[PDB]
Amino acid sequence: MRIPLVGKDSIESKDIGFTLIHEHLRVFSEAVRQQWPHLYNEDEEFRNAVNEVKRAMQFGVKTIVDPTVMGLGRDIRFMEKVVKATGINLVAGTGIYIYIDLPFYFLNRSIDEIADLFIHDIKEGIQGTLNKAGFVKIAADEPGITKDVEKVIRAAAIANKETKVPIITHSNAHNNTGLEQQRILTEEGVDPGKILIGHLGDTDNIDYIKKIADKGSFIGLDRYGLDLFLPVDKRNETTLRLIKDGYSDKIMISHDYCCTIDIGTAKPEYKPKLAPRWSITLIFEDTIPFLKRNGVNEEVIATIFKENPKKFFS
Amino acid sequence: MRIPLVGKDSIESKDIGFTLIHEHLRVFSEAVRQQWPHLYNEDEEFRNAVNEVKRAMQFGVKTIVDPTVMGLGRDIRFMEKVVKATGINLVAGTGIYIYIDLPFYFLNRSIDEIADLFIHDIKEGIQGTLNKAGFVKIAADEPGITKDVEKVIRAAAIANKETKVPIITHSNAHNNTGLEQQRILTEEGVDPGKILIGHLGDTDNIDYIKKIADKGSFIGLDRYGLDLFLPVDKRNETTLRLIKDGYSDKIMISHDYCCTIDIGTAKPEYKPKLAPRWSITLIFEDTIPFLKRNGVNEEVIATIFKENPKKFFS
Ligand SMILES: CCCCCCCCCC(=O)N[C@H]1CCSC1=O
Ligand SMILES: CCCCCCCCCC(=O)N[C@H]1CCSC1=O
Ligand SMILES: [Co+2]
Ligand SMILES: [Co+2]
Ligand SMILES: [Fe+2]
Ligand SMILES: [Fe+2]
Numbered sequence A, B: 001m002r003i004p005l006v007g008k009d010s011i012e013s014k015d016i017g018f019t020l021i022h023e024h025l026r027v028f029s030e031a032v033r034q035q036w037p038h039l040y041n042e043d044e045e046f047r048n049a050v051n052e053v054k055r056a057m058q059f060g061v062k063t064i065v066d067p068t069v070m071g072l073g074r075d076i077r078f079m080e081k082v083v084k085a086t087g088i089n090l091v092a093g094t095g096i097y098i099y100i101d102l103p104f105y106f107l108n109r110s111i112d113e114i115a116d117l118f119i120h121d122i123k124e125g126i127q128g129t130l131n132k133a134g135f136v137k138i139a140a141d142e143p144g145i146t147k148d149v150e151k152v153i154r155a156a157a158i159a160n161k162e163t164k165v166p167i168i169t170h171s172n173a174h175n176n177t178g179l180e181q182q183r184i185l186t187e188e189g190v191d192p193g194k195i196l197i198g199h200l201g202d203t204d205n206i207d208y209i210k211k212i213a214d215k216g217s218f219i220g221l222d223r224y225g226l227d228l229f230l231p232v233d234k235r236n237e238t239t240l241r242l243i244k245d246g247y248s249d250k251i252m253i254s255h256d257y258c259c260t261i262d263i264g265t266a267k268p269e270y271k272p273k274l275a276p277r278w279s280i281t282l283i284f285e286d287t288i289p290f291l292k293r294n295g296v297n298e299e300v301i302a303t304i305f306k307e308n309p310k311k312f313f314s
Helices: A030-035 A042-058 A076-086 A111-123 A147-163 A177-187 A206-214 A232-244 A268-274 A287-292 A298-312 B030-035 B042-058 B076-086 B111-123 B147-163 B177-187 B206-214 B232-244 B268-274 B282-293 B298-312
Strands: A003-005 A008-011 A063-066 A089-092 A094-096 A136-139 A167-170 A195-197 A218-221 A251-253 B003-005 B008-011 B063-066 B089-092 B094-096 B136-139 B167-170 B195-197 B218-221 B251-253
Touching: A003 A089, A008 A089, A030 B030, A042 A076, A076 A089, A094 A111, A094 A147, A111 A147, A136 A147, A147 A167, A147 A177, A167 A177, A177 A195, A177 A206, A206 A218, A206 A232, A218 A232, A232 A251, A232 A287, A251 A298, A287 A298, B003 B089, B008 B089, B042 B076, B076 B089, B094 B111, B094 B147, B111 B147, B136 B147, B147 B167, B147 B177, B167 B177, B177 B195, B177 B206, B206 B218, B206 B232, B218 B232, B232 B251, B232 B282, B251 B298, B282 B298
Parallel strands: A063 A089, A094 A136, A136 A167, A167 A195, A195 A218, A218 A251, B063 B089, B094 B136, B136 B167, B167 B195, B195 B218, B218 B251
Antiparallel strands: A003 A008, B003 B008
16 A cells, blocks of 8 residues: 555555556636536536546556646546546545646645645545545746745645655746756755656757756656647657657656646637647557657566656655 | 525615625635635534624615625525525625636637626526626736736626626725726726726725726725725725715725635734724724714715615616
């Protein structure tokens, strides 16, 4: 017992198997869904998540890590239902996803108070259930490291030191938010190897990507299919080059796929342009085959999808 | 019938009686309550709301207008419960309360889509019930009229023009947001007399306040008790001056009282410093008696608390 699973006994990290380290069963804006429920369709949402997960499993995915947290509409009971329907190993997290400011709740509250929220989810359980958080998720994006973003990062560090769960980040690959997240976490005493810096796959600036890896953290080549950020072929070229340059033991790969997401950008009519082949199994259809016919040994595949997740959670 | 009430048949505006135009039964951050329910206590929240409303009614309040909307934790079923327990006339609103950016939901969504949400609440009902919204609430504060804040303002104008419900605003009294809100709404073709520009009582700059009244809108002297914004006695002096200068036709008075609110600023420890006498009945204890001692007659009080709300909703 080591990594907590939704709706299951916890597992030892050696038993995680082939892992997708960053996918979403469902993403929504909490306040919008609360205020305007007519916009949403839970049956559709359930069907989509179950269908995607089932296809992932038939490609041999054993574990999915789902970093839906506050600000992305985390719902542990929804996650429970998808587990019961599929039998997936599902790792749920805690944390806060913001780009600018915290919710008004956090006015005149300390970093300690925020960390207490994360530690609650990890140690006690999530949203009144006994499903526990297996990692902390934090974000920064275009606005950079604002005061409140930094507060959340330091709170995540406190949670990691207390509970030893790893940290997954959302960053923007085109500013230095990823590097800064790494810096602040490590200065606060987080083991660099307990950090996945997210969304670095959004750039082909490999010098920047290697910088983070060199400082000891996993690098998230983690949005395969999201062409609007970076097209699949450039992602593949970047992935291949990083492998050839010796970085396979820092690489993590995923789709960031949202089986449903409520943002207007994800309207069906935009899909062909923005994310034509985006799904939870694209890497099996494209990336892994591509790697194998470009000289990449099976051992590297094992490293990225089994060994690295195992280390991360160890 | 043409003001909708929570849990009651709609009433004619002439029957609104003595009104508190801006009070909150309960405020919370949607995403925080959703993610960490352990932080909250609905029984306590209910008791607080019921007790405050009961005292208001003892002092002759017939109708309370509650501008709790998206971003402040509007919950129409909680509101229903308080109505059942008290018998108050309660006017619920629709709208969006943001200072900077919209929820991610609204990425690549039009102003029209926003207005449709408001119009849904007005014409169809709120959160899956048949309780309908009687006004739209919008906000701006220190960050000023941002792109997204502006979008919401324009959506409110669409809603008013379509349904004729009035608009209540939140503004920052020190940075012209209230005047800008008025300008944008009236430029869109909203009748100035269907706008309440909020939180103008937070300043004793009467030149600024008069500017807004002169352009035909109601002026919100509406945070009595919140000394951290402006002390009661200075509000009183400002209120009295405006009345002496003939402006009672535009004056609206309230507390902005929150029977519960979840922000750290409102920890009990802080109340004596920030808001010692803040409650839903302060104006009966202090303000109204003060005005009377200064020669303000019953008719003026009736204009402010009965006639003006009547006009607002007519
Ligand atoms: C029609 C399809 C277009 C793609 C949707 C727009 C891009 C959405 C990206 C997205 O899902 N971002 C969130 C969710 C998981 S991580 C994160 O920060
Ligand atoms: C210790 C008690 C002092 C309260 C300080 C916090 C002031 C909150 C005022 C307040 O209510 N502001 C928001 C929330 C409801 S409407 C609105 O615009
Ligand atoms: Co992300
Ligand atoms: Co306000
Ligand atoms: Fe994600
Ligand atoms: Fe308010």
